[PDB]
Amino acid sequence: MAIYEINGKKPRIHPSAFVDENAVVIGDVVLEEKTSVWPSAVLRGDIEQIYVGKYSNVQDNVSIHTSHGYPTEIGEYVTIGHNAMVHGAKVGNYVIIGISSVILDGAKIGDHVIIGAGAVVPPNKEIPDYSLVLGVPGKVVRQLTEEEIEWTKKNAEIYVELAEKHIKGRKRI
Amino acid sequence: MAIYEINGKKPRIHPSAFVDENAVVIGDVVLEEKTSVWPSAVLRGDIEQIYVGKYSNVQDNVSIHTSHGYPTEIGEYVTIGHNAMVHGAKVGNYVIIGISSVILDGAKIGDHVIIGAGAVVPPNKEIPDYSLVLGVPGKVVRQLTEEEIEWTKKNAEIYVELAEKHIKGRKRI
Amino acid sequence: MAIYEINGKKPRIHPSAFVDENAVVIGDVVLEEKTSVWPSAVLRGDIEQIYVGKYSNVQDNVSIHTSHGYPTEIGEYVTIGHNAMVHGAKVGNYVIIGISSVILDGAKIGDHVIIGAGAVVPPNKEIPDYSLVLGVPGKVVRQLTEEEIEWTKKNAEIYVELAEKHIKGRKRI
Numbered sequence: 001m002a003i004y005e006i007n008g009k010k011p012r013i014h015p016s017a018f019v020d021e022n023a024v025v026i027g028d029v030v031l032e033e034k035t036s037v038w039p040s041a042v043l044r045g046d047i048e049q050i051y052v053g054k055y056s057n058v059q060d061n062v063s064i065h066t067s068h069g070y071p072t073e074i075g076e077y078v079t080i081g082h083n084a085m086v087h088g089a090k091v092g093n094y095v096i097i098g099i100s101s102v103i104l105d106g107a108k109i110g111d112h113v114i115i116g117a118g119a120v121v122p123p124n125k126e127i128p129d130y131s132l133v134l135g136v137p138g139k140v141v142r143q144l145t146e147e148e149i150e151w152t153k154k155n156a157e158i159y160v161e162l163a164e165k166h167i168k169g170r171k172r173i
Numbered sequence: 174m175a176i177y178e179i180n181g182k183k184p185r186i187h188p189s190a191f192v193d194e195n196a197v198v199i200g201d202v203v204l205e206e207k208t209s210v211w212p213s214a215v216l217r218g219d220i221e222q223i224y225v226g227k228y229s230n231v232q233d234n235v236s237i238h239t240s241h242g243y244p245t246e247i248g249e250y251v252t253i254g255h256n257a258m259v260h261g262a263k264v265g266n267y268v269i270i271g272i273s274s275v276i277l278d279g280a281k282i283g284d285h286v287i288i289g290a291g292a293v294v295p296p297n298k299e300i301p302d303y304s305l306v307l308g309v310p311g312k313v314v315r316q317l318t319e320e321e322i323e324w325t326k327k328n329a330e331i332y333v334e335l336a337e338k339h340i341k342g343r344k345r346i
Numbered sequence: 347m348a349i350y351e352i353n354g355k356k357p358r359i360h361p362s363a364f365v366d367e368n369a370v371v372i373g374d375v376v377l378e379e380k381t382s383v384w385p386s387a388v389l390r391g392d393i394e395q396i397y398v399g400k401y402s403n404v405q406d407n408v409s410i411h412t413s414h415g416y417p418t419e420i421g422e423y424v425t426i427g428h429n430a431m432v433h434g435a436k437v438g439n440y441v442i443i444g445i446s447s448v449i450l451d452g453a454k455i456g457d458h459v460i461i462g463a464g465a466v467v468p469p470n471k472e473i474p475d476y477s478l479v480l481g482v483p484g485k486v487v488r489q490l491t492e493e494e495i496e497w498t499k500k501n502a503e504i505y506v507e508l509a510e511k512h513i514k515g516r517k518r519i
């Protein structure tokens with residue numbers, strides 16, 4: 001992909017990870033196995049680290065950043081929806097970050113959680129496992145259903161396949 | 174522009190269409206006559222197709238995508254505002270997709286419609302012709318005025334001219 | 347960076363300004379001293395001018411544009427948050443444009459002002475100095491505190507340092 005290293009920090013990207021050449025990864029950024037960074041996404045690891053767990057995907061026009069003392073940590077089987085923005089937050093496993101939504105500094109998102117599209121999780125907000133978050137400021141509206149809890153993973157699995165699909169069949173023309 | 178083809182699918186772009194080299198078009202994507210894809214926009218046609226009708230424009234940092242069974246179809250004289258995101262939705266003719274707004278899967282937008290900036294049209298939401306949509310979840314608040322109905326087209330026409338302006342006078346330095 | 351000139355108009359960029367090669371600057375755009383345009387940001391100066399004052403930063407996946415008669419003017423010590431969008435608005439000094447927020451045409455933002463993340467300042471909206479704006483449509487909710495008024499500047503100063511950090515230690519790999 002389009003990768004840079006800043007000063008001492010250099011990105012650590014597992015070989016099976018997919019990173020679109022139109023995406024931008026800078027500095028201290030960790031990308032685990034079968035992860036994916038899509039077209040025009042930006043992972044700027046120029047102060048605290050940006051860690052992305054396995055089977056996790058960062059969609060298009062998404063931006064990920066941090067603040068002094070607030071690094072961004074993403075768990076496994078996590079989806080970061082198109083045009084979303086995560087700034088110095090901690091996200092657990094099996095989580096869907098809605099499209100064009102915003103997760104702010106100090107935020108702690110639990111596992112098996114869905115954040116609604118366009119939602120804004122306030123700074124230092126703690127979201128319990130199995131929660132559906134909506135609104136601005138975003139808030140827990142109810143617990144996930146079995147079908148949504150199943151989706152919290154399938155969506156990530158779908159992207160693992162997509163990533164592989166681009167690694168092998170993508171071709172510039 | 175920055176165009177890729179994935180597996181069997183290759184983008185079909187009318188000669189008069191404008192596609193910024195900083196934009197990204199992937200796979201099964203159709204771009205009709207005098208259409209325009211602007212800087213940093215992303216049209217990822219890696220599962221269902223992304224179809225864009227005539228005199229339609231996809232502005233900067235915009236992302237367009239789909240889901241299995243939910244392809245994205247854009248009509249004519251349609252504006253997709255800066256930083257907006259359209260995912261597997263059907264949009265009619267003469268429509269203004271507001272800036273940083275979101276249109277979700279299964280959504281059916283009628284003709285001569287304006288979607289407010291930052292608005293979020295829920296999944297499978299059907300928006301009647303001549304409607305002004307606002308909020309999150311977005312909802313019809315009132316019918317378009319004659320002046321807005323005139324704007325639903327002029328805005329697209331303005332971009333057709335802009336596109337031509339870049340095709341002829343744009344120059345990298 | 348990735349800079350283009352359109353027709354007669356060519357970007358005027360102070361030597362100390364930082365412009366990521368993944369960012370896009372087009373046409374009539376002015377970037378003052380120690381300013382910064384970050385990864386994937388877009389400053390399209392293809393109708394009215396886009397002016398950016400000193401110590402100001404335009405973060406990732408941000409889009410800045412204008413409309414006929416409505417040029418975009420950004421003051422000094424101004425932060426334009428990740429994924430935000432400014433369209434033909436006038437912004438004063440010491441202002442924080444929240445993440446994924448939207449500032450529309452005709453808007454007049456005063457000095458020492460903070461716009462909440464995901465907020466949408468309506469067209470022609472005038473925001474008084476020292477205000478905290480929230481919601482959609484965005485509105486003044488209360489006046490800034492001394493700590494926030496101090497932050498209105500520190501945040502910009504932090505980026506001036508960051509910019510310098512990339513200019514000297516950034517390296518593609």
Ligand SMILES: [Ca+2]
Nearest residue numbers: 040061213386
């Ligand atoms: Ca972008």
Ligand SMILES: [Zn+2]
Nearest residue numbers: 065066087428
């Ligand atoms: Zn930041």
Ligand SMILES: [Zn+2]
Nearest residue numbers: 082238239260
């Ligand atoms: Zn998607």
Ligand SMILES: [Zn+2]
Nearest residue numbers: 255411412433
């Ligand atoms: Zn525009």
